[PDB]
Specification:
part of a larger assembly; 4 chains; A mainly beta (226); B mainly beta (105); C mainly beta (211); D mainly beta (128); B: 105 residues; mainly beta; Immunoglobulin-like; 6-stranded antiparallel sheet; 0% helix; globular; C: mainly beta; 5-stranded mixed sheet; 5-stranded antiparallel sheet; 5% helix; 43% strand; elongated; binds a molecule of 6 linked components (NAG-NAG-BMA-MAN-MAN-MAN); binds 2-acetamido-2-deoxy-beta-D-glucopyranose; immune system/inhibitor; HIV-1 Envelope Prefusion Trimer; Entry Inhibitors
């Protein structure tokens, strides 16, 4: 019923205002609590802050001095603004709905209770990289094949992570296998997607490899054939 | 459009690293970078061309390096005469040499 | 934050004790997180679990004070490998901003699986660009650790190789990629190129040649 | 070796059109391009254009596209590998915002990728 979807730049220069947004699908926004969570490599999950149903804010003191969370009720969008970003600010920024719980141990009249918040539905994450380097679209090269056979699609020299790859614009989905990237010494990632198809399908089921690298708005297509 | 380092300094014996970068119009992986030592209002000097090839006689402490997004000029083992203004330049084989902003060292 | 490991045999019952013990009445949340993926709230109140989570995930309620918060995962499977966070709230301490430590759960006694190596020669368009890359794609292997070895003809080649650290797949197996970069002349002037993938005790070779 | 003596540093006023000379020695004048470079004070140094003392082919920046005339006269054989040459420079719709020091520099190599690159410079001339 309720799903969330993040969206961000992916690349932000050092000492610059990072800005992400998050869309709610199915439910409203001004009747729930929403939290921003990031997860850096090596470091654990870090709670950034949250916003109420009355649009009241409360930031983590770890980054209180430079985080501003907002909300737009015209639709179901809530944003995040983080300035003065450093190299340690690159992470997968998640977006989740917080649910207020009231743990009561003594007398509510004396205030012998405390509120706790928990995230019950999360987003999918937005990869964000803080680097002085500039974005670069990839270079797609086909890998033609020769029981069954396997063909590929080589996505080399792009920055930064990630890159989505679908086969036949989304039609081909069985046997697809996209492999994690590789950070070469030059500083650019290199991917590789491969599907296993029946050998007899070589003539002539068209195999269109789709590649999208949003940090450079450079989508490309390429066909494979022996 | 070809931005250089604002300014920087060092000391005798240490090293310097000048920067030079720009957009897809003048940089980089499909262009060559030359580094000119240019005292203000005097005869310039070609230090390094083709990203890292030194001119005949240039001291080996001068070294060039080009990333896929920014070219560099290292000036190791400083000396008194290094107090000049340096300018980078982007060119191809059959075109012009778009100079850089400048870097006071 | 720091990571504390835990090994549980396949099919056993995992007992993940919380990182910090409560000073008063508590309300503890349990999150499941596998890196590169969104967390999964397993239990929100001291024992209340949301929908879409099996009954084998259980937490300890706050009946009497002194009971430690432990997440119990009965009947562990290879999918239960993830980081487990214990978001601890209590009447005494302040506002729980930190999710706490991270219990890295690995499930022992999983079936050994041999890799599926697939080597591709340099594409024509890449060679037209005066560059050439050999790619060695390894997948469906467990335990997730392999060693690649690139050889020009029979002599070894280590200058120009880039290999991925293994990555868990959706079927709980691992995948790795190896990229050998070389000039297009070194691809023509040699007879054949091979990618040796050694996994566990055995080694598997896939070779390619410009023909 | 190689020398490139430039003209005098006299000054004029806007609307005019001045000629700048560059006399070469110690090298074959035909074998290398001749570049014209401008070091204004209210701007970064600008490459104006180069010309071929051998093929007559010229190439100038689009900022000087229809405003500059680059000409060279044929060399004079001194020895088997030495000749004397001269290069000329003119400006059309000239103002006073084009004020600065002007240099002439010959090409780097006779072939390759950095053929025309300004390598050996002159002493410069002050303008208006
Ligand atoms: C005698 O001596 C003279 C003087 O040294 C020699 O002339 C020089 O020859 C070399 C090599 O042939 C030249 O170097 C090349 O320079 C070009 C740059 O010119 C290009 O750009 C012009 C302006 O943009 C353009 O107009 C030209 O295009 C045509 O138009 C002219 C009009 O006259 C025509 O003459 C041309 O022939 C063209 O048809 C021109 O294309 C540059 O592009 C070259 O780089 C390429 O090639 C090198 C390898 O050679 C390669 O490394 C590069 O990556 C790139 O692929 C190359 O640098 C030089 O410009 C000539 N002139 C000089 C030095 O003043 C002559 O060759 C000698 N002849 C003999 C018989 O000894
Ligand atoms: C440059 O000056 C010479 C001098 O006679 C002239 O013949 C030539 O046409 C001029 N060039 C241009 C482009 O007008
Ligand atoms: C080319 O050779 C001549 C021969 O004396 C030399 O003077 C000149 O410096 C050389 N050019 C370069 C760029 O070194």
């Amino acid at each position: 019923q309720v799903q969330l979807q993040e969206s961000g730049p992916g690349l932000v220069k050092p000492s610059e205002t990072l800005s992400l947004t998050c869309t709610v699908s199915g439910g409203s926004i001004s009747n729930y609590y929403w939290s921003w969570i990031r997860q850096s490599p090596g470091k654990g999950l870090e709670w950034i802050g949250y916003i109420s149903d009355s649009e009241s804010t409360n930031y983590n003191p770890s980054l209180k001095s430079r985080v501003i969370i907002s909300v737009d009720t015209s639709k179901n969008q809530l944003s995040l603004k983080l300035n003065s970003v450093t190299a340690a600010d690159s992470a997968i920024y998640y977006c989740a709905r917080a649910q207020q719980g009231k743990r009561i141990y003594g007398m509510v009249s004396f205030g012998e209770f405390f509120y706790y918040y928990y995230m019950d539905v999360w987003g999918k994450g937005t990869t964000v990289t803080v680097s002085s380097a500039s974005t670069k679209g990839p270079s797609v090269f086909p890998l033609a094949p020769s029981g069954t056979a396997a063909l590929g699609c080589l996505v080399k020299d792009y920055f930064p992570e990630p890159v989505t790859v679908s086969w036949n614009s989304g039609a081909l989905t069985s046997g697809v296998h996209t492999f994690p990237a590789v950070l070469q010494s030059s500083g650019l990632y290199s991917l590789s997607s491969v599907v296993t198809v029946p050998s007899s399908s070589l003539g002539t089921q068209t195999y269109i490899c789709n590649v999208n690298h949003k940090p450079s708005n450079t989508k490309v297509d390429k066909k494979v054939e022996p | 459009v070809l931005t250089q380092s604002a300014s920087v300094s060092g000391s005798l014996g240490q090293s310097v690293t000048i920067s030079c970068t720009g957009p897809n119009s003048v940089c980089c992986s499909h262009k060559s970078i030359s580094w000119y030592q240019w005292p203000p209002g005097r005869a310039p000097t070609l230090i390094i061309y083709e990203d890292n090839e030194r001119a005949p006689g240039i001291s080996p402490r001068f070294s060039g390096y080009k990333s896929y997004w920014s070219a560099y000029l290292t000036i190791s083992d400083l000396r008194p005469e290094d107090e000049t203004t340096y300018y980078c330049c982007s060119y191809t084989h059959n075109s012009g040499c778009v100079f850089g902003t400048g870097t006071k060292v | 934050s720091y990571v504390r490991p835990l090994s549980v045999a396949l099919g056993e019952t995992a007992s993940i004790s919380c990182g910090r013990q409560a000073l008063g009445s508590r309300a503890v949340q349990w999150y499941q997180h596998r890196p590169g993926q969104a967390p999964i709230l397993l239990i929100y109140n001291n024992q209340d679990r949301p929908s879409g989570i099996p009954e084998r995930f259980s937490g300890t309620p706050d009946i009497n004070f002194g009971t430690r918060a432990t997440l119990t995962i009965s009947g562990v499977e290879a999918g239960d490998e993830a980081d487990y966070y214990c978001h601890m709230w209590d009447s005494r301490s302040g506002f729980s901003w930190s999710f706490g430590g991270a219990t890295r759960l690995t499930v022992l006694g999983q079936p050994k699986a041999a890799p599926s190596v697939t080597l591709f020669p340099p594409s024509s368009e890449e060679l037209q660009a005066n560059k050439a890359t050999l790619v060695c794609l390894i997948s469906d292997f467990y335990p997730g650790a392999v060693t690649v070895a690139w050889k020009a003809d029979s002599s070894p080649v280590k200058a120009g190789v880039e290999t991925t650290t293994p990555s868990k797949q959706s079927n709980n197996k691992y995948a790795a990629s190896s990229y050998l970069s070389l000039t297009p002349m070194q691809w023509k002037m040699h007879k054949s190129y091979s990618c040796q993938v050694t996994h566990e005790g055995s080694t598997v070779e896939k070779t390619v040649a410009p023909t | 070796q190689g020398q490139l003596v430039q003209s005098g540093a006299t000054t004029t006023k806007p609307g005019s059109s001045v000629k700048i000379s560059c006399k070469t020695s110690g090298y074959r004048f035909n074998f290398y391009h001749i570049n014209w470079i401008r070091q204004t004070a209210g701007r970064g140094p600008e490459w104006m254009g180069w010309i071929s003392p051998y093929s007559g082919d010229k190439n100038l920046a689009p900022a000087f596209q229809d405003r500059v005339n680059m000409t060279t006269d044929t060399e004079v054989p001194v020895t088997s590998f030495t000749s004397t040459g001269a290069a000329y420079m003119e400006i059309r719709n000239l103002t006073s915002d084009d004020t600065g020091t002007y240099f002439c520099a010959k090409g780097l190599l006779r072939d390759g990728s950095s053929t025309w690159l300004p390598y050996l410079w002159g002493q410069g001339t002050l303008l208006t």
